């Protein structure tokens, strides 16, 4: 296959709390690699949208706060690779992170894939109560709200299995890092 690398790129905050991706990882976003780009909103600036369009073969977004004029663009978007109902968001709508309340809203939208990038801005993943948890922290690597590494993930979703190649640029001198994670959905 090798058709849909599902990168978790987000936490844009441009120019909200960010302006640019690290050069290596930014050019790692050259078109022709993936036909699938996962932007998650609050880009924000118009130039962000323009460069995205020039750079992104895939347009599926959630609705975002810092975003004044294209308030028309949907709150969310459901995707299917193989046979999956896929939910993606930030994490703002709920007051907390409670995975069970999250999957509550998910059932209110009927998706079995659960990915977001909220306001604590961490990477952690696991399953509790029969569903899987996806948040990478500031995929733009920006400073968090809490007391970050840019975390996009070569999420290899075909069928019910996900392989995750996360590319990480952390300073010791900066260091390009790759971690491989595999997840198969309980269908």
């Amino acid at each position: 296959s090798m058709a849909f690398l599902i990168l978790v790129i987000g936490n844009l905050h441009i120019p909200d709390r960010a302006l640019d991706i690290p050069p290596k990882f930014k050019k790692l976003l050259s078109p022709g690699k993936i036909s699938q780009t996962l932007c998650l909103g609050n880009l924000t600036d118009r130039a962000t949208y323009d460069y995205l369009r020039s750079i992104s073969p895939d347009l599926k977004i959630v609705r975002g706060r810092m975003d004044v004029e294209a308030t028309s663009l949907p709150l969310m978007q459901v995707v299917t690779h193989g046979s999956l109902r896929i939910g993606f968001l930030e994490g703002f709508t709920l007051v907390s992170e409670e995975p069970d309340v999250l999957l509550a809203e998910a059932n209110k939208l009927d998706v079995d894939v659960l990915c977001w990038a909220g306001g604590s801005h961490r990477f952690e993943c696991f399953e509790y109560m029969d569903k899987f948890f996806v948040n990478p922290g500031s995929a733009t690597g920006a400073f968090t709200t809490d007391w970050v590494v840019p975390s996009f993930c070569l999420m290899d979703v075909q069928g019910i299995s996900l392989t995750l190649y996360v590319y990480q640029l952390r300073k010791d001198t900066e260091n390009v890092a790759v971690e491989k994670v595999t997840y198969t959905k309980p269908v």
Partner: protein, 748 residues
């Protein structure tokens, strides 16, 4: 044409000449054939282009004639046929006869060359035809090119001195034609005659081409400084000296030239204004450029030379600034590092020209393009112009550009400043950027942001490179530097907010080393508010206020994090306020109070006079709305004074525990439910039940007491029943029942 007939005739002539030369013993008829062939060469019925083609034909045939010369004639001699056939008043036939004889003699022996050559030059006084003279001397040069002596100059007739004499006199007499050729004939023929001149310039430059392999620098200057320069001052033709200095540039090792091009400039400062001096100059500058930067304060000398020149010339905008930017590149070549003189060129050469150039606004004049190129030439040239950025007489030149040129330079500068990233800055960059901005939108859909938006972004971003202590002062610089007026700062501000607010943390990195960090933090809060109103000063715009609302919120949580949160309290209140100003859209406030709740929920360090107070206040905010579901959403979102929620609540206000207000917000929830009972809709009610049981089990599993399993079992059965018993089908119903049985699994 006459050309075709003459070419055919001379072709049969050289055919029989080959019949003569390939079979030896026919020297007499061969000489007669050459003589009658050049008899047609005196016939100038061939137009100079037709004559050129026929001359090239006879010249390639004449190379073979010279081969036959070298092969046969070196045997004994040829005795004075010139004087023997001298009976006619004509010159050219016996002329070329003895010329072929001399070509034979030079083909054999190097000694007799200068004798017969001076013979040809002396007896050439009878040739009043200058075209035939030039053609002949070019033939001699191309021939004696392989026969003119060189560093083996030993004293026989013909040496470096004598060969350079022969080549120079032929050169200058062919120059005399090349001049008259433009004018010999009918006066109206001057156009085609300039055509002839341009066509035959290289036939004369061949002299210098042979001069290439010749006299060294002392001999060079001596033998050349006089004669050809006097030829120049005598002819005063543009193309003449142009092509001449061109071939000169390319002809000798320029250790010769540049060590003479100084005093050569001193000599040739004489040029007429209607002569294309600038092409000469720029070709020189070309030599000097691929001289220097190809990896005598020529600045002083040559700059003052061209100073005199433009002073001796009258260069309009175009020629002036063309030579100006060429000088710029030229200095960039010779003295990149001798910058002092370069900024002298800037201020007291180029800026003084600029204003001294009393020429009105000019863009159709490409001279503005030349000046722009000029300005950017060290920009486009240095990898490190920040070095030149440390010069105002580098940048203070900028007022001297007009609005169109101004934002031209603006695009250029922003390009410069965008590709790069900013290092440690004294206030100097701040001077530079005062310039930049006061050029930027000062004085008085932004199709290209042009480019100030992507610009301002990376501007304030490189600004972060600054360090804390001065970062506030230069924050002043920034902010009021944004005193331009209204409809811009929407494109500006959140960056600026952030600048201040993360400077808060940079400063705070010294709270363990300061107490005035409280006072410097004050200074912050002040400057914050300063900007804050500065944008509130701008109410006119749609959808931009809500922003600064959120911005205020951000500064608030900032001070919360700066631990000097005494005032963010006030920020949060006045945020509510400017809301009450900005009340126009439903879904706007929907998300807005959503953000309010989030932020406050992330606030846990204030005192009760802040803590519980603001809890009630946000409760009010929630309560103050119009349409049901979304409200209820935020309502049960706001539930956080008493019990278990959320994990992020690592708080010692409740001993590392969580605060999930239970009972009061619960009765508020019941309130909301009964209010929603006034809806009369199916899917809405479905949602209602969903979140109801969501939070119910959310309490029960998180050990919330008064949420007893009896309420929950009875109500889930009630919802299932009235759902099934009195509510019509829709896919929502079944997805909800799925969610519901899931919840049942989750009841634990």
């Amino acid at each position: 044409r006459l050309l075709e007939d003459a070419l055919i005739a001379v072709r049969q002539q050289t055919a029989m000449m080959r019949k003569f030369l390939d079979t030896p013993g026919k020297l007499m008829d061969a000489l007669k054939c050459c003589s009658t062939l050049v008899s047609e060469l005196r016939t100038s019925s061939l137009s100079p282009k037709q004559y050129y083609e026929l001359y090239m034909a006879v010249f390639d045939a004449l190379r073979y004639l010279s081969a036959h010369l070298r092969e046969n004639h070196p045997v004994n001699h040829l005795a004075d046929l010139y004087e023997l056939v001298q009976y006619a008043g004509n010159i050219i036939p016996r002329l070329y006869l003895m010329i072929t004889v001399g070509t034979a003699y030079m083909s054999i022996d190097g000694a007799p060359v200068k004798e017969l050559m001076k013979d040809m030059m002396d007896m050439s006084r009878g040739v009043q035809h200058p075209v035939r003279g030039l053609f002949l001397r070019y033939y001699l040069s191309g021939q004696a090119r392989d026969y003119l002596p060189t560093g083996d100059s030993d004293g026989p007739e013909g040496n470096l001195q004598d060969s350079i004499n022969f080549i120079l006199t032929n050169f200058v007499e062919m120059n005399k034609l090349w001049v008259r050729l433009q004018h010999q004939g009918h006066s109206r023929e001057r156009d085609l005659r300039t055509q002839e001149r341009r066509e035959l310039q290289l036939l004369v430059g061949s002299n210098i081409v042979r001069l290439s392999q010749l006299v060294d620098l002392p001999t060079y200057r001596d033998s050349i400084l006089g004669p050809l320069l006097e030829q120049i001052v005598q002819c005063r033709d543009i193309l003449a000296q142009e092509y001449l200095l061109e071939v000169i540039t390319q002809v000798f090792p320029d250790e010769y030239h540049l060590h003479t091009l100084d005093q050569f400039l001193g000599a040739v400062s004489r040029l007429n204004p209607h002569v294309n001096v600038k092409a000469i100059v720029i070709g020189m500058m070309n030599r000097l450029s691929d001289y220097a930067e190809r990896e005598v304060p020529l600045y002083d000398i040559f700059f003052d030379q061209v100073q005199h020149l433009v002073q001796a010339q009258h260069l309009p905008i175009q020629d002036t600034i063309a030579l100006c930017c060429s000088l710029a590149n030229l200095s960039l070549n010779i003295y990149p590092e001798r910058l002092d003189y370069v900024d002298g060129i800037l201020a007291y050469a180029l800026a003084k020209v600029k204003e001294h150039a009393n020429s009105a606004d000019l863009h159709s004049q490409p001279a503005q393009q030349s000046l722009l190129s000029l300005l950017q030439s060290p920009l486009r040239r240095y990898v490190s112009i920040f070095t030149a950025l440390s010069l105002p007489t580098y940048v203070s030149l900028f007022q001297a550009q007009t609005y169109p040129t101004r934002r031209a330079i603006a695009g250029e500068i922003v390009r410069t400043l965008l590709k790069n990233q900013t290092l440690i800055s004294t206030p100097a960059h701040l001077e530079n950027v005062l310039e930049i901005l006061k050029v930027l939108i000062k004085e008085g859909e932004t199709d290209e942001t042009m480019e100030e938006q992507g610009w301002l972004a990376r501007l304030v971003h490189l600004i972060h490179s600054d360090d804390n202590d001065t970062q506030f002062r230069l924050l002043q610089m920034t902010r009021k530097a944004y005193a331009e007026g209204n409809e811009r700062i929407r494109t500006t501000t959140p960056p600026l907010i952030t600048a201040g607010l993360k400077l808060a943390r940079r400063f705070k990195a010294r709270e363990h080393y300061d107490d005035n960090w409280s006072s410097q933090s004050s200074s912050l809060f002040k400057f914050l508010h300063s900007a804050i109103s500065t944008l509130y000063t701008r109410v006119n715009g749609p959808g931009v206020a809500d922003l600064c609302l959120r911005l205020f919120c951000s500064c608030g949580q900032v001070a919360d994090m700066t631990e000097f949160e005494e005032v963010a309290y006030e920020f949060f209140a006045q945020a509510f306020t400017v809301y009450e100003e900005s009340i126009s859209d439903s879904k706007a406030q929907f998300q807005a109070v959503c953000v309010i709740a989030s932020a406050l929920h992330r606030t846990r360090n204030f005192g009760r006079e802040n803590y519980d107070t603001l809890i009630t206040k946000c409760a009010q905010h929630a309560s103050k709305l119009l349409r049901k579901p979304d409200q209820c959403r935020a309502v049960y979102l706001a539930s956080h004074l008493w019990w278990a929620t959320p994990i992020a609540a690592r708080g010692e206000t409740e001993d590392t525990e969580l605060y999930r207000d239970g009972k009061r917000v619960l009765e508020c929830l019941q309130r909301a439910l009964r209010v929603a009972d006034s809806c009369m809709e199916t899917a809405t009610s479905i949602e209602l039940f969903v979140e109801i049981l969501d939070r119910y089990v959310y309490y029960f599993d998180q050990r919330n007491e008064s949420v007893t399993t009896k309420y929950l079992n009875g109500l889930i059965e009630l919802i299932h029943s009235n759902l099934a018993g009195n509510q019509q089908d829709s896919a929502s119903v079944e997805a909800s029942r799925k969610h519901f049985i899931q919840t049942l699994e989750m009841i634990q």
